[PDB]
Design a protein around this ligand. Structure first.
Ligand SMILES: COc1cc2c(N(C)C3CCN(C(C)C)CC3)nc(C3CCCCC3)nc2cc1OCCCN1CCCC1
Ligand SMILES: COc1cc2c(N(C)C3CCN(C(C)C)CC3)nc(C3CCCCC3)nc2cc1OCCCN1CCCC1
Ligand SMILES: [Cl-]
Ligand SMILES: [Cl-]
Ligand SMILES: [Cl-]
Ligand SMILES: [Cl-]
Ligand SMILES: [Cl-]
Ligand SMILES: [Mg+2]
Ligand SMILES: [Mg+2]
Lengths: 355, 354
């Protein structure tokens, strides 16, 4: 609820010095702060004026304080990107930036639950928002090295790690038995033969990174915001959509070990996939709706092949990622069980595609 | 004019990887690059497509490559540059990477010192500066930059020992003024001088003002302010005072000490009134509706303000130049420039009777 007394005091000075109006002349004893998220990295706090204090101009009543904590040229990219999205009215406003963190617009909202991804109005808007993200010019590397670069890097770490615990040695032995280095090379040749435009991708578009905006619940459209662009890069479009479709199957809010639920049957049906891309394509491609019914159908069918092939890379990348987390992460989670779930889905999807 | 071998190749990869369209499929042997500014810090290059190559979309034909060369200074400048680019108040930002960035190439030349006094130039610098001062930026709104920077440079100056006889004698004369005490006299003068806190350029001089190619015949819209390295929330008086000081300094002199200083080039009361008469209505659009008497009172107070803050321009950049004398590898009469700034400081102090 309340933060440590040292971070209360640091938060007070940051707010007092970076925010205009009533903030400039606020006393420590009138400063309201409360935790939104703990951890050792990207701690969130809500900072606010007293309800009895009047604003003098257009300064916010409440802001979000983000402390980096345990983390250079990762911070400039994220900071520039955040600033750019704020200027374009695609993200929260940026009120303050300093070495320890930043002050952001506080958006009254909650995150989505996994089940909400299949609500047709939610799915259609995630598609429209993702299409808008993909149309953005960003001053980052346009070479799509991120996907295979990251898979190669995680695979290298996976082959070199040894466990001592009996359960983890048995689980790792099963995963290595798939011949991951060979499977990676089969995946490379499949995806190289699968045309997918290079676009600015979120790379982690899941329920936990989608805000439902308070007061907008009754609106069909324009009630969501995409956040948390930690993994964002120029990447194959197919991966961003494929990864999103995969995330229909995974719930990270389960309160008992292994702290996730996986359900292969929750993957979107062809009808749910077509609903999603029917909203994506007109948002991404000017006057898509004016094309012939036959051309629209052909583009849609090709895109389903594309995103369902790139979905394999979602399973592979996050599967490898989870094995590495099993060794190095201090967050309590069934990393090895999650890896097995991703590889089970990888082979299930391989069978469905006939590849 | 031609870059080194490794720089040609690194520039080619940066342009190929960060720029869209025809840049994506460009070969080494088609890449055109030429130096605009040398050194081992803030090297500038012009990079361009062949004249024979067609653009595929709205990608630029030519871009500026800026290499930093020589942490939390680079994030602020980068965020600020990105923000000004989104607001169409700076060059577009095409690429950012650890070694530098790719910027919009603006067809232009820099102003000469003599051009600052042309009434149409002066009026537009005032309008542009007033626009800059209106901007909301995600930086510290406490005006700690001015005295914080003077304190920091003074700390470095009192640690300098030279071995060369001429530099020891020049430093000894500057230290003889009791700089720590003079800084405190300046503090008491400026703390008694009201000046609103605004987002300041802090270095508004002819070399940071572009005359835009094709717009020479335009009365009001032919300039752009660039190079926001020193930008921060600061007293408005300093941004204008520093600009008035820069009428006296020409950094294009071809012989040692590679600058000219002329105290007589400082703007007259008439030139100062012309500048602030353009600034005030650009900063507050309702200014012209005030009574002639109220406008006159605000203008007279502002002349006191900016001419007092001008003393901080001499002090700050004087201290800065002494430190450059020790640490800089750029050829310049840093110690002579420091003495020129302190000569001006004491000359203007006496004229003001403060
Ligand atoms: C994907 O696995 C994650 C699980 C996390 C977690 N999980 C799932 C646990 C699960 C159990 N939760 C309670 C019930 C014990 C604590 C959070 N808690 C947190 C919190 C965020 C604030 C609190 C400190 C860290 N952060 C997590 C981050 C995670 O990955 C982030 C990058 C990977 N993404 C790509 C693939 C999907 C996710
Ligand atoms: C010491 O600061 C400067 C040095 C310059 C220079 N210096 C450092 C040298 C002078 C001697 N050099 C050679 C001939 C030996 C050339 C560049 N050459 C130039 C020229 C202007 C004409 C066109 C080319 C760039 N312009 C310069 C401009 C400078 O601006 C100072 C204003 C910035 N403020 C911040 C700190 C002081 C006040
Ligand atoms: Cl990024
Ligand atoms: Cl395969
Ligand atoms: Cl800055
Ligand atoms: Cl020396
Ligand atoms: Cl005297
Ligand atoms: Mg999910
Ligand atoms: Mg000058």
């Amino acid at each position: 609820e309340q933060p440590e007394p040292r971070t209360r005091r640091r938060a007070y000075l940051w707010c007092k010095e970076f925010l205009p109006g009533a903030w400039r002349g606020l006393r420590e004893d009138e400063f309201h702060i409360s935790v939104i998220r703990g951890g050792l990295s990207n701690m969130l706090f809500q900072c606010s004026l007293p309800d009895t204090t009047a604003t003098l101009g257009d300064e916010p009543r409440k802001v979000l304080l983000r402390l980096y904590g345990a983390i250079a040229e990762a911070m400039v990219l994220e900071s520039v990107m955040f600033a750019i999205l704020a200027e374009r009215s695609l993200g929260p406003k940026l009120y303050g930036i300093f070495p320890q963190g930043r002050l952001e617009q506080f958006i009254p909202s909650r995150r989505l639950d996994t089940e909400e991804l299949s609500l047709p109005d939610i799915s259609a808007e995630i598609a429209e928002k993702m299409a808008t993200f993909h149309g953005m010019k960003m001053p980052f590397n346009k070479e799509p090295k991120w996907l295979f670069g990251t898979m190669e890097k995680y695979l290298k770490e996976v082959l070199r790690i040894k466990f001592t615990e009996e359960s983890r040695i048995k689980k790792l032995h099963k995963l290595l038995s798939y011949n991951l280095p060979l499977e990676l090379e089969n995946l490379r040749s499949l995806l190289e033969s699968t045309p997918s435009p290079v676009v600015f991708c979120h790379n982690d578009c899941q329920e936990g990174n989608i805000l439902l905006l308070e007061g907008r619940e009754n609106s069909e459209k324009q009630k969501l915001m995409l956040i948390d662009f930690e993994y964002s890069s120029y990447n194959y479009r197919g991966f961003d959509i494929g990864n999103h479709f995969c995330e229909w199957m995974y719930d990270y809010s389960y309160e008992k070990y292994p702290f996730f639920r996986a359900n292969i049957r929750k993957y979107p049906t062809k009808k749910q996939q077509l609903h999603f891309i029917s909203s994506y394509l007109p948002a991404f491609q000017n006057d898509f709706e004016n094309l012939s019914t036959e051309e629209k159908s052909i583009i849609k069918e090709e895109m389903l092949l594309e995103v369902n092939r790139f979905a394999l890379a979602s399973h592979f990348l996050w599967g490898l990622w989870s094995i590495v987390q099993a060794k190095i992460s201090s967050i309590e989670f069934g990393y090895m069980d999650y890896a097995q779930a991703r590889f089970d889905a990888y082979f299930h999807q391989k069978r469905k595609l006939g590849v």
